[PDB]
Design a protein around this ligand. Sequence first.
Ligand SMILES: [Mg+2]
Ligand SMILES: [Zn+2]
Ligand SMILES: [Zn+2]
Lengths: 1265, 107
Amino acid sequence: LDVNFFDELRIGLATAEDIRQWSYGEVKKPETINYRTLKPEKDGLFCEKIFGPTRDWECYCGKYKRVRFKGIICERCGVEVTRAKVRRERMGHIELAAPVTHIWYFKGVPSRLGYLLDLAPKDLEKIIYFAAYVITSVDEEMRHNELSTLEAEMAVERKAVEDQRDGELEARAQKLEADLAELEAEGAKADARRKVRDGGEREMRQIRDRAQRELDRLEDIWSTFTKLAPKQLIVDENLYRELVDRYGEYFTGAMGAESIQKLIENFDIDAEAESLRDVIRNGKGQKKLRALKRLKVVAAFQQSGNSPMGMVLDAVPVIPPELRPMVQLDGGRFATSDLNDLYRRVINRNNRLKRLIDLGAPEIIVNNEKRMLQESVDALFDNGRRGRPVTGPGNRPLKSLSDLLKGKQGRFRQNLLGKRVDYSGRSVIVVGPQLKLHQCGLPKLMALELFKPFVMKRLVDLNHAQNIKSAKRMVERQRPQVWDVLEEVIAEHPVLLNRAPTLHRLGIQAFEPMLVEGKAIQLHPLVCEAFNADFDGDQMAVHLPLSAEAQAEARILMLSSNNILSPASGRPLAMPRLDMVTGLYYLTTEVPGDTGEYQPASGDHPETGVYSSPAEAIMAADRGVLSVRAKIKVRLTQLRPPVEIEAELFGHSGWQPGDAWMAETTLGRVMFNELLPLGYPFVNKQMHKKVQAAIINDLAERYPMIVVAQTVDKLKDAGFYWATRSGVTVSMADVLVPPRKKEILDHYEERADKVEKQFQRGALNHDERNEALVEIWKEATDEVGQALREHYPDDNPIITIVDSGATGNFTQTRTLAGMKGLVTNPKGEFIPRPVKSSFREGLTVLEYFINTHGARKGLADTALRTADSGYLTRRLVDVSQDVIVREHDCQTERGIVVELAERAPDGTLIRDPYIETSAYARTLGTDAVDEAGNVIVERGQDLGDPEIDALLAAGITQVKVRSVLTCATSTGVCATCYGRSMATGKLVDIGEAVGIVAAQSIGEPGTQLTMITGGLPRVQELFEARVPRGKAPIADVTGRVRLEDGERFYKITIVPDDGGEEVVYDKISKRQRLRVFKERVLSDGDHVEVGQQLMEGSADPHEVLRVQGPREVQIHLVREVQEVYRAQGVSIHDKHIEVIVRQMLRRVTIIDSGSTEFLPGSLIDRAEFEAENRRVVAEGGEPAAGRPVLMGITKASLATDSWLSAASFQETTRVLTDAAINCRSDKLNGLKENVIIGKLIPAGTGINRYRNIAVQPTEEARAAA
Amino acid sequence: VLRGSRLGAVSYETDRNHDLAPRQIARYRTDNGEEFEVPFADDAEIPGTWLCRNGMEGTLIEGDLPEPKKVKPPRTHWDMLLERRSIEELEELLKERLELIRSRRRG
DNA sequence: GTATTGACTTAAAGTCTAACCTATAGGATACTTACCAGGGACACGGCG
RNA sequence: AGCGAG
DNA sequence: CGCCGTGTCCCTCTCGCTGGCCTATAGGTTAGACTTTAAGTCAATAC
Ligand SMILES: [Mg+2]
Ligand SMILES: [Zn+2]
Ligand SMILES: [Zn+2]
């Protein structure tokens, strides 16, 4: 109905009564349509009488028609006359002739049916598929009382079989007497008599073996009866039949799904649950473990009022026909839905079962039919789960009813969270440098097609068209007059531009579209790095916001000129790069001895280098007098001087717009400083990439973002102009080889030859020689690189591009000129040849072949890595959906300590290297104290660059800041604890989805992390909390490390200072080398602390958590992830990893239930844990002890309270099976659930405080108007 | 595009809830004591038997009760036997079987 | 222009008759069992 | 299936 | 009652383009024309 009356979405088992209450009929015949008239057939799968009419408002024959007969049913055909779209809504149901079991609750490991009934999965599969009988009832009373009468009968029968046995023995004796009489009365061979006698005694041995067979056949059956109890499986139906004919009463046995039905019927959940609870409480061991797992399914059917019966089906619901359409494709060729085949099979087998039971058939045929019906329902619900999948034409599996939901191509992920949209286009992008940062060229044809609903209206209003259809005709023929109207419609109507993949937020940005001539979207050069879009065919898509809210969001939140800083680290993303950096570096660089320079020589003439104003400087530049890169002194009267000269000449209130000063700089630096705002002081620095980035950072921090956008645009223009004028170009004469190359190659080939000799004399093995040669040639490559670096002039276009920060590193320059160096084996090792030639010299054939290995390996690795990083990003987004800013402040005292500078041994504070990503953009939780003095900066400060400067000046290192980890608010986090928003540059808003931003910021730099595990796999196993490969154990208690030296192992024993119970470590492998504890490596009998890693590598986060509480595992995780990301050279603020880590540590393991519905081993949320403790302290206190646990991103995501998000995340079938068993209601509170149900997400502009803002004119405005 | 169709069609006709044809809800009762309402139009005799949502036919619950008759059980093994054998030989075989069993029990 | 009657022809049923589909049955020598990944996590049976 | 961008 | 081995299940990036046997009976359905009837049409006329 309405997305506001959508408070909850409950899932549970659908009993047969519910299934036949949904149904509007029963599909009784396995038919779809008529072959000739091509109309729905009666009682068929597409029956019009059940699911409604194929045409709006008609009965099947035609008697009743049109809306005037709405809600009626024709008495001839029985079709209800209503809208045909109800065929997408009404369901049917097949009434199975015999019960079947839902496959989801049988095959899905763990078998929930088995756990409920305590039947082994093999036994359940035997019973359900008619391979073994099972006993469902036993009259213990009549068993007990007749245990003597039937004992008497069995004694009689045993006596009779023994009597025939002894009669057979006597017959043997008589025949043996005859045989011996024959043997010893007539003349025979000495052995022939013994041959026949042994033959006869062997016949009697066989007779006694038959007697033993009978004794077994009777006594085994009696024993089987004596222990006959319910839920006992009976293979070898011969024994079963003998039992039924003999002790048929005293026990009831069945076979198949109906037997499980009877078992569940005769199954009191309360008593079983109570017995299981007693067993888990009193017993222990593996028995208790199996008991506990069974109580996760036996409790679910108790806590809720759900029957355990929904597992066994008596009716199968039939999906509405239009969800499985039968369409007449062009050419008449009909196209089934692949589900009508499975339904047809089910109905055929059900009807055949009905007929077989009606006729009266031997149990073999009817049981085979029942097994087939069970298999058909299984295939309908899940193909290929048991046995070979049911295949259709072409030998392909039939798309079952569950395959529609699972996978990347399933329904939850291909049609609900991601959809195709109207009002969208795609085209190749071409750079437009004449655009402004908030503009994008939009091809005329694409814009006209996108906006044609609007253009039709406008050219009807202008009277260029008479009505809407005429206007549409003009648009379809692109009449010459519909282009100006287009320009009038497109005005200030933002369009979102997207480039797949959207690795982060700034991959969708709203631009004010401008019309361009042909077929290409003109993108601004600056937003390229935001999109990661270069112009070699990088198509991108354009979406058109329609509603007022959509336009407002595109214009305010997403405008490209509003998104300059990266949300990950806050560094500018729209700053100039490549050509513009080269242009600005060329413009602002100074070259001594240039034309027009400044010379102070006297005695013959004045300095003859000084200029009265920048206008005169540019006039001189026009003449061949003054270069733009020549040191001069100029009189400046419109650009503010730097802090030192300002404080000297002005001191206090230097008002620069009018005052004049002397600037000893180049003209290019003056021209550049004219691009920056008026308030910005003179820079007077060569503009490397780093310097430009720092300038833009400072500008964004101090000035409004509009000023930032305009300054950035002017910088782009100047950079392009002076990159054109820079004359950077490449030629084989601009690539200089080092002149000492041959001497170096000879000097190192001598060492290589010495190593080869040494190998030839057996001095060292193959591996050692390979390593030595690798080292030699590595040193050689280093030396030739140094020679090349020192040989190059500082003016060369190659080195100028590399060393101006524009692009490229010096390794590429060395590869181009000099020595490419060693090359990687296809396996991964280093080939020791090596490639001893440059790319300017040209590689030989074999050198090129050796080179190709690593390049192909890298191109395959890049694909696999982008896949892995995308998967990790998906997991990180899904885990932290529910972390969004809710409040402004917790007022929580708890905080995290950050070290900042480190005290020098001689005494000095050196700034910590990784401080920009740790302490910046954080809020102080506790006031800073310097030498027990006053406060340098108190709590509740953004802790920006001036703050850090002041702290380092004071002489204080550790400071307590507020972080999401120690955030007291329960739902999401708060603005203050989260801190400053890196993108916006100020305190975060009260609706920001910081979880999504954190996930995207962590997962975008992946695909640039060049994978102990040390790259993307390391981050993957850190977030997943998996035990690492290099499980390096850490100490448990402060003590002395009694170390040994073992063979194939070690023992890092430790004798504590608690003196308690010294623990030893296991077969710690010899390959793992010892760690460097503080300078001295771990020495035998050395005092270690509580956490000092003993062996090299990583320590599994779980152990460090168990040993040091949650805070130290938090620090360990953040430090390890940040170390992995720094090792490659990527900067991510610590707060994003902190958000993810916070999401990982939110649950507690239950050790003691207490007396409140808490299973041992259950992972329960800490907030709910505390709430239950508060509820239980009163009315009798039974504290349920618990212990912190570190989950992973996948486990933490799939444990959410919403089944709609967990199901759409991963393992849809398991999630839905468990949710159905538990009767879980989804409150529809996260972002994924709201997206799925198509209602406003509770973040950003959708929260309840911003959405229902009341807007009205101010009273004075109304009075004026 | 392959451009398929579900057959049937669409009909934009301004939905009316005001002037609607008169209806007479008719109750039917199945075998398993389940009532079922059916909105038939007044200008048509209410049928005496409806295949209800239950999946089994139900008669009208008012009086009437026409109670028709249908063909007896389509066929039967005995009937098929009587189309290839007569009574006298079947009786003779029954006597042979009876005497055989009597000899088995008492001789 | 707007009030009528008297013919004068016409499509739409409404119905009876005929053929062409449709549900169904049957067939008697004898034949008797069909057909290339890994990587991680969890659960079940053996052995000590 | 081949193919493009990352 | 632990430790091990084996079997099974789920996962593995986004977007985009092109085109490749026979017979016999009984019963229901429709098509086709005949006859009737509501329906559309024309001519003259009076106020
Ligand atoms: Mg590209
Ligand atoms: Zn009808
Ligand atoms: Zn907080």
